[PDB]
Amino acid sequence: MSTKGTILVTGGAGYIGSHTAVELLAHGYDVVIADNLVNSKREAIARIEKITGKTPAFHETDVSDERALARIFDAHPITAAIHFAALKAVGESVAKPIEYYRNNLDSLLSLLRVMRERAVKRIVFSSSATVYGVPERSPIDETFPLSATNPYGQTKLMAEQILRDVEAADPSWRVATLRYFNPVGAHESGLIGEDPAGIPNNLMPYVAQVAVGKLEKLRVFGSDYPTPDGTGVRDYIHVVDLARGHIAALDALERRDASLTVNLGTGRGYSVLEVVRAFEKASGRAVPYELVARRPGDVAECYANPAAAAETIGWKAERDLERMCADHWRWQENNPRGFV
Amino acid sequence: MSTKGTILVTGGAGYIGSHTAVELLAHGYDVVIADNLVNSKREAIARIEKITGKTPAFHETDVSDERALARIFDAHPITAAIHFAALKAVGESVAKPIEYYRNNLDSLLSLLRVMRERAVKRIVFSSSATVYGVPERSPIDETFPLSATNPYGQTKLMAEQILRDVEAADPSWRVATLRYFNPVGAHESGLIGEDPAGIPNNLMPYVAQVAVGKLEKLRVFGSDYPTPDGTGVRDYIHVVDLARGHIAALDALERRDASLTVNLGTGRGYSVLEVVRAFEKASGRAVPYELVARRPGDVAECYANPAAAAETIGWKAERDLERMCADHWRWQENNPRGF
Ligand SMILES: NC(=O)c1ccc[n+]([C@@H]2O[C@H](COP(=O)([O-])OP(=O)(O)OC[C@H]3O[C@@H](n4cnc5c(N)ncnc54)[C@H](O)[C@@H]3O)[C@@H](O)[C@H]2O)c1
Ligand SMILES: NC(=O)c1ccc[n+]([C@@H]2O[C@H](COP(=O)([O-])OP(=O)(O)OC[C@H]3O[C@@H](n4cnc5c(N)ncnc54)[C@H](O)[C@@H]3O)[C@@H](O)[C@H]2O)c1
Numbered sequence: 001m002s003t004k005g006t007i008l009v010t011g012g013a014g015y016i017g018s019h020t021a022v023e024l025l026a027h028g029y030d031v032v033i034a035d036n037l038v039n040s041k042r043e044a045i046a047r048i049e050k051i052t053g054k055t056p057a058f059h060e061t062d063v064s065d066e067r068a069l070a071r072i073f074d075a076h077p078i079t080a081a082i083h084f085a086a087l088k089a090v091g092e093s094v095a096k097p098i099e100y101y102r103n104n105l106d107s108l109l110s111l112l113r114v115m116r117e118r119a120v121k122r123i124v125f126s127s128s129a130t131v132y133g134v135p136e137r138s139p140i141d142e143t144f145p146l147s148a149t150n151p152y153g154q155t156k157l158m159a160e161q162i163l164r165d166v167e168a169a170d171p172s173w174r175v176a177t178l179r180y181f182n183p184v185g186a187h188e189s190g191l192i193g194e195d196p197a198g199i200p201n202n203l204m205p206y207v208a209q210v211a212v213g214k215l216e217k218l219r220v221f222g223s224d225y226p227t228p229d230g231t232g233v234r235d236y237i238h239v240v241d242l243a244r245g246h247i248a249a250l251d252a253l254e255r256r257d258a259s260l261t262v263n264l265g266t267g268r269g270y271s272v273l274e275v276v277r278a279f280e281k282a283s284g285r286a287v288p289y290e291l292v293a294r295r296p297g298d299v300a301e302c303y304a305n306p307a308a309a310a311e312t313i314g315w316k317a318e319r320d321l322e323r324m325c326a327d328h329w330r331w332q333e334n335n336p337r338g339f340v
Numbered sequence: 341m342s343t344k345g346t347i348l349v350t351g352g353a354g355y356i357g358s359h360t361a362v363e364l365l366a367h368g369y370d371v372v373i374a375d376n377l378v379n380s381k382r383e384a385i386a387r388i389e390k391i392t393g394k395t396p397a398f399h400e401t402d403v404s405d406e407r408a409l410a411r412i413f414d415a416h417p418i419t420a421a422i423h424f425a426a427l428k429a430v431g432e433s434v435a436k437p438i439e440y441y442r443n444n445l446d447s448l449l450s451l452l453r454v455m456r457e458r459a460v461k462r463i464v465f466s467s468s469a470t471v472y473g474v475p476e477r478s479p480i481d482e483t484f485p486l487s488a489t490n491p492y493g494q495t496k497l498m499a500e501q502i503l504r505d506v507e508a509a510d511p512s513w514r515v516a517t518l519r520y521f522n523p524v525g526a527h528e529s530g531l532i533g534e535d536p537a538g539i540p541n542n543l544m545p546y547v548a549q550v551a552v553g554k555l556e557k558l559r560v561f562g563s564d565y566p567t568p569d570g571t572g573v574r575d576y577i578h579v580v581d582l583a584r585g586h587i588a589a590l591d592a593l594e595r596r597d598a599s600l601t602v603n604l605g606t607g608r609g610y611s612v613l614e615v616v617r618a619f620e621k622a623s624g625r626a627v628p629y630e631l632v633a634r635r636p637g638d639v640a641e642c643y644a645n646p647a648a649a650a651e652t653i654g655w656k657a658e659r660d661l662e663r664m665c666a667d668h669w670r671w672q673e674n675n676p677r678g679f
């Protein structure tokens with residue numbers, strides 16, 4: 001077994017967690033994935049093994065079930081946890097706020113209690129730029145005022161508050177909270193990537209499905225924003241860069257003997273139209289679109305100040321927009337219908 | 341059936357819940373109480389029946405157990421809920437945040453899930469002046485900035501947010517959020533009242549127990565506050581007035597066909613030493629005290645602007661500090677064993 005660590009990755013069958021499980025295994029950690037497959041497929045776990053040549057432990061477990069979760073700790077000498085498990089569809093969160101609060105807050109609360117009981121005190125938490133609400137300006141740094149405009153954002157704000165209070169009660173806690181911006185792309189092998197259920201809510205999967213022929217036409221949400229081409233601007237970050245950030249975060253908790261909160265982004269914003277043009281160039285496929293009305297709740301612009309992460313955890317985004325598009329496209333083309 | 345309504349009162353064996361169940365029953369509502377008795381006794385339910393001559397249904401259930409809660413809805417024609425169920429020890433909330441978040445958030449979320457399932461969409465929620473954090477001034481009105489200094493307060497802020505979101509999801513929801521200040525006193529029968537376990541964290545039960553002689557002397561937390569006598573100033577409100585505010589709230593939800601958020605306070609603050617002095621007069625007993633160091637987290641001064649409640653729900657506090665002390669004292673004397 002590993003002398004580096006044994007990492008419980010909740011939500012590890014999903015998009016970012018699968019990529020993270022890959023990087024952990026590649027760096028010699030032991031990995032235990034807990035995922036109830038509410039938004040992911042079992043075959044993603046097989047593909048993590050096809051990539052790494054290593055078999056992480058897998059438990060098909062609702063992590064809000066403390067009894068079920070404690071049986072995972074019975075079976076494995078967990079040294080730290082990365083908590084990816086959550087529902088994450090904003091539109092759905094507005095429609096079903098109770099389930100979002102229940103799933104997202106109870107899964108965290110359950111983990112925290114089992115960890116406390118088992119004296120495991122190292123946790124990395126998936127937060128979001130959604131905690132910055134309507135930003136006054138970009139680039140956004142960590143000391144910006146926190147608010148949210150949708151229940152999904154609220155679950156992330158409330159999670160961060162819970163984590164602070166848990167450490168306030170037991171100062172032995174070491175928490176890395178990582179506020180991701182807009183992850184896109186896929187492992188360079190093409191063997192894993194994002195596999196949305198149904199019609200994608202997010203930009204790059206929609207673009208990719210237009211490119212492969214699964215969808216007919218991209219809709220661009222709003223063309224009158226206060227941005228150079230009137231379309232929304234976001235900080236797209238390669239999911240492999242994001243996954244490496246998690247190894248950096250764990251090392252930083254160790255070295256610093258202290259909690260940290262840091263943005264994970266590139267610092268460069270791209271408009272919707274810039275993304276489409278980049279994807280067409282990288283893919284060689286057409287992405288026809290139409291300019292339609294703003295989607296309610298969207299901000300004009302949002303991108304990170306990556307400075308804190310560079311200083312605190314020694315991490316920077318490496319892969320550019322072209323590479324994000326190229327790698328997302330390889331996954332889509334080679335897996336036209338997603339996993340199996 | 342009551343023609344008025346069948347009200348699910350979660351946490352209804354507790355202090356404010358029991359008083360509110362009494363006012364509901366007396367005003368012709370049917371009442372179903374769900375309480376896991378984590379901070380109250382079954383005897384309280386017998387007392388409600390004694391006071392009122394009516395028999396509320398009672399279910400000894402953890403309201404965060406959605407399955408157990410659904411069985412309650414199965415059995416009763418619930419028209420609205422008033423959610424008092426929570427853990428409320430501020431000090432314990434700092435030491436035990438996971439337990440507070442789990443209890444206070446899951447109980448509400450389970451309730452809201454079941455209510456949506458059964459299409460019951462009227463709720464009154466027990467919030468607190470704690471949501472105002474450290475106020476910039478008093479009287480405090482409802483539009484003051486919200487913040488909290490402990491996990492207990494965080495659970496109230498989070499609850500208020502969850503409730504706004506439930507209505508954003510389904511705009512037929514009607515939510516009366518009521519921010520209580522400092523409830524004190526007891527039903528005038530003396531048959532129910534505040535029954536803390538162990539030594540009381542809050543002012544008046546400690547003063548009442550000092551006056552009766554169960555505790556030797558009152559400790560006063562700080563004497564160097566920017567107040568007239570240097571001790572903390574608070575908006576004390578008679579729990580019977582408070583309970584009455586819940587009936588007003590239910591009615592206003594119907595009238596305005598709109599959600600509301602109001603303070604329930606008197607608008608008048610009294611200092612720690614002013615409470616002591618008034619209790620002495622109503623009880624005819626002495627209350628010895630020692631001036632000690634400030635209690636961390638304690639605010640110098642906090643009292644409500646009662647204007648919005650008066651206008652929005654037609655309610656005002658009637659009972660004065662003298663009445664609060666006399667009623668609290670009657671409970672204390674007649675029930676040395678508590679419940
Ligand atoms: N993708 C993004 O744009 C983005 C941006 C910021 C933050 N995040 C956060 O990052 C994390 C991962 O996002 P993702 O894109 O990988 O989404 P994802 O849906 O692919 O991954 C989440 C995984 O969690 C699982 N899960 C959900 N609830 C669970 C529960 N109760 N028990 C066990 N498993 C559960 C799902 O089945 C899924 O596999 C989430 O916390 C999300 O909120 C995502
Ligand atoms: N100073 C105050 O007393 C004050 C001020 C502002 C707000 N509040 C709020 O008013 C409400 C009632 O307060 P109170 O003074 O009557 O306290 P209380 O402890 O007497 O009443 C709360 C009741 O809820 C019950 N309960 C707790 N969790 C439960 C669960 N999961 N399922 C079923 N029952 C549960 C307890 O057994 C108790 O009987 C609480 O929500 C409290 O936070 C109180």
Ligand SMILES: O=c1ccn([C@@H]2O[C@H](COP(=O)(O)OP(=O)(O)O[C@@H]3O[C@@H](CO)[C@H](O)[C@@H](O)[C@H]3O)[C@@H](O)[C@H]2O)c(=O)[nH]1
Pocket residue numbers: 090128129130153181182201202203204206219220221222231232233234272295298
């Ligand atoms: O079909 C689409 C999808 C998106 N967009 C636009 O593309 C940009 C990116 O949107 P999307 O990929 O949906 O991400 P965001 O809305 O920036 O952020 C989503 O929502 C945030 C909460 O508001 C979450 O925190 C993130 O994880 C992310 O998924 C926005 O300007 C959208 O208006 C389109 O024009 N058409």
Ligand SMILES: O=c1ccn([C@@H]2O[C@H](COP(=O)(O)OP(=O)(O)O[C@@H]3O[C@H](CO)[C@@H](O)[C@@H](O)[C@H]3O)[C@@H](O)[C@H]2O)c(=O)[nH]1
Pocket residue numbers: 428430468469470521522541542543544546558559560561571572573574612635638
């Ligand atoms: O033994 C005591 C108890 C209280 N006080 C003082 O009396 C005042 C009232 O205190 P207490 O009765 O504890 O109420 P608060 O602290 O104002 O607030 C209570 O407790 C929470 C904050 O601590 C609030 O959110 C409410 O729930 C309320 O019950 C404060 O100035 C205290 O410093 C004393 O001097 N000695």
